[PDB]
Design an enzyme around this catalytic site. Structure first.
Site, PDB file in Angstrom:
ATOM      1  N   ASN A  10      48.478 -27.840 -26.927  1.00  0.00           N
ATOM      2  CA  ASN A  10      49.749 -27.165 -27.130  1.00  0.00           C
ATOM      3  C   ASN A  10      50.353 -26.748 -25.793  1.00  0.00           C
ATOM      4  O   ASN A  10      50.593 -25.565 -25.531  1.00  0.00           O
ATOM      5  CB  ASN A  10      49.577 -25.952 -28.031  1.00  0.00           C
ATOM      6  CG  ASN A  10      50.893 -25.444 -28.558  1.00  0.00           C
ATOM      7  OD1 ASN A  10      51.777 -26.229 -28.912  1.00  0.00           O
ATOM      8  ND2 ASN A  10      51.041 -24.123 -28.605  1.00  0.00           N
ATOM      9  N   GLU A  36      49.393 -33.207 -27.259  1.00  0.00           N
ATOM     10  CA  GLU A  36      50.453 -32.237 -26.979  1.00  0.00           C
ATOM     11  C   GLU A  36      50.406 -31.708 -25.540  1.00  0.00           C
ATOM     12  O   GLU A  36      50.348 -30.499 -25.302  1.00  0.00           O
ATOM     13  CB  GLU A  36      50.482 -31.093 -28.007  1.00  0.00           C
ATOM     14  CG  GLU A  36      51.467 -31.318 -29.160  1.00  0.00           C
ATOM     15  CD  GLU A  36      51.903 -30.028 -29.852  1.00  0.00           C
ATOM     16  OE1 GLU A  36      51.393 -28.938 -29.501  1.00  0.00           O
ATOM     17  OE2 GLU A  36      52.767 -30.106 -30.750  1.00  0.00           O
ATOM     18  N   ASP A 149      44.905 -35.244 -33.262  1.00  0.00           N
ATOM     19  CA  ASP A 149      45.621 -34.517 -34.292  1.00  0.00           C
ATOM     20  C   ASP A 149      46.234 -35.501 -35.284  1.00  0.00           C
ATOM     21  O   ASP A 149      47.283 -36.089 -35.033  1.00  0.00           O
ATOM     22  CB  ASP A 149      46.708 -33.637 -33.672  1.00  0.00           C
ATOM     23  CG  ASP A 149      47.429 -32.789 -34.709  1.00  0.00           C
ATOM     24  OD1 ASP A 149      47.229 -33.036 -35.925  1.00  0.00           O
ATOM     25  OD2 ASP A 149      48.199 -31.883 -34.314  1.00  0.00           O
ATOM     26  N   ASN A 151      47.291 -34.722 -38.200  1.00  0.00           N
ATOM     27  CA  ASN A 151      48.322 -34.006 -38.949  1.00  0.00           C
ATOM     28  C   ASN A 151      48.263 -34.193 -40.456  1.00  0.00           C
ATOM     29  O   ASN A 151      49.273 -34.040 -41.138  1.00  0.00           O
ATOM     30  CB  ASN A 151      49.719 -34.355 -38.438  1.00  0.00           C
ATOM     31  CG  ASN A 151      50.246 -33.334 -37.451  1.00  0.00           C
ATOM     32  OD1 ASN A 151      50.680 -33.679 -36.353  1.00  0.00           O
ATOM     33  ND2 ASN A 151      50.195 -32.065 -37.831  1.00  0.00           N
ATOM     34  N   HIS A 247      45.567 -24.813 -31.908  1.00  0.00           N
ATOM     35  CA  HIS A 247      44.441 -25.622 -32.373  1.00  0.00           C
ATOM     36  C   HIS A 247      43.167 -25.145 -31.693  1.00  0.00           C
ATOM     37  O   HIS A 247      43.212 -24.344 -30.765  1.00  0.00           O
ATOM     38  CB  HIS A 247      44.625 -27.105 -32.032  1.00  0.00           C
ATOM     39  CG  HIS A 247      45.730 -27.777 -32.783  1.00  0.00           C
ATOM     40  ND1 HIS A 247      46.975 -27.209 -32.949  1.00  0.00           N
ATOM     41  CD2 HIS A 247      45.783 -28.983 -33.395  1.00  0.00           C
ATOM     42  CE1 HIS A 247      47.742 -28.032 -33.642  1.00  0.00           C
ATOM     43  NE2 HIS A 247      47.042 -29.115 -33.925  1.00  0.00           N
TER      44      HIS A 247
END
Length: 257
Positions: A10, A36, A149, A151, A247
């Site tokens: 992130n 990310e 990820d 998702n 995360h």
DNA sequence: CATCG
DNA sequence: GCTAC
DNA sequence: CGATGCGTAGC
């Protein structure tokens, strides 16, 4: 003895500010897969490209502070493939792959369709394009870990509020179905679930309310592994001591050389 | 998307 | 403030 | 249940 970590940071920069750079070495990880980045090659410190002298390969988005994935490896990849061969998504830096002989590890950041409509659509098209190469990879006849990820939460046990989230992106029937196919119809091992069939093992918590405190989470970060290597799996855990992101890093250890 | 009503 | 989450 | 709002990193 082989340790692989997968972490949606992130913001690689944010994460570095929160102590992730030190974690990269303290973890003992032989390979780290990051998603990310929220950064382009230019915004990248040298310590965010070759952490602790590890090798590193990235794929950044054609937009500042957006997506991107990387893989760092204590060993030198005798090959690397950036982007997944179809520009439409490669513009978003969403797929990196590295081959170390028989082994291949890849960092993946599957599109989140929660923000709005077209995003959901793109997510579906991405699944469409991806499935065929998941299959081809399966057929390569070698050891492959696709981490990142995804998702998509697979089953009810994969998120605290499965009841009220069946109409939200991440837990729609189509998505769960897709995952199901890649695991069963394709034979990919969802390493965590296969290792501990009863433990939820969330990897993400929304910033809303007190989700992180009440452990109201989702397990949307996977390490999907091929059969032979999967069987060699020995341990896994979600690192939760420090918080580098919304995360948490998912670490898996394989008895493999 | 956790939370309220 | 704005955007994608 | 369906309808309210809403924290973050980085432009």
């Amino acid at each position: 003895m082989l340790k692989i970590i997968s972490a949606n940071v992130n913001g690689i920069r944010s994460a570095y500010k929160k102590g992730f750079y030190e974690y990269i070495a303290a973890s003992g990880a032989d390979i780290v897969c990051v998603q990310e980045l929220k950064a382009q090659e230019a915004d990248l410190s040298a310590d965010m490209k070759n952490p602790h002298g590890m090798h590193g390969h990235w794929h950044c988005a054609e937009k500042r502070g957006y997506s991107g994935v990387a893989v760092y490896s204590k060993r030198k990849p005798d090959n690397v493939q950036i982007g997944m061969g179809i520009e439409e998504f490669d513009r978003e830096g969403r797929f990196v792959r590295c081959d170390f002989g028989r082994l291949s590890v890849i960092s993946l950041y599957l599109p989140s369709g929660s923000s709005a409509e077209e995003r959901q659509q793109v997510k579906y098209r991405f699944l469409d394009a991806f499935y065929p190469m998941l299959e081809a990879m399966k057929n390569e006849g070698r050891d492959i870990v696709v981490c990142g990820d995804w998702n998509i939460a697979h089953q009810n046990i994969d998120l605290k509020n499965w009841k009220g989230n069946q109409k939200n992106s991440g837990f729609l029937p189509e998505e769960r179905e897709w995952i199901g196919k890649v695991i069963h119809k394709l034979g990919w091992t969802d390493m965590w679930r296969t290792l501990y069939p009863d433990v939820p093992g969330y990897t993400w918590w929304s910033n809303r309310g007190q989700a992180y405190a009440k452990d109201v989470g989702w397990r949307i970060d996977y390490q999907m592994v091929t059969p032979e290597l999967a069987a060699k799996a020995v341990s896994a855990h979600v690192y939760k001591d420090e918080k580098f992101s919304d995360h948490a890093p998912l670490v898996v250890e394989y008895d493999y050389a």
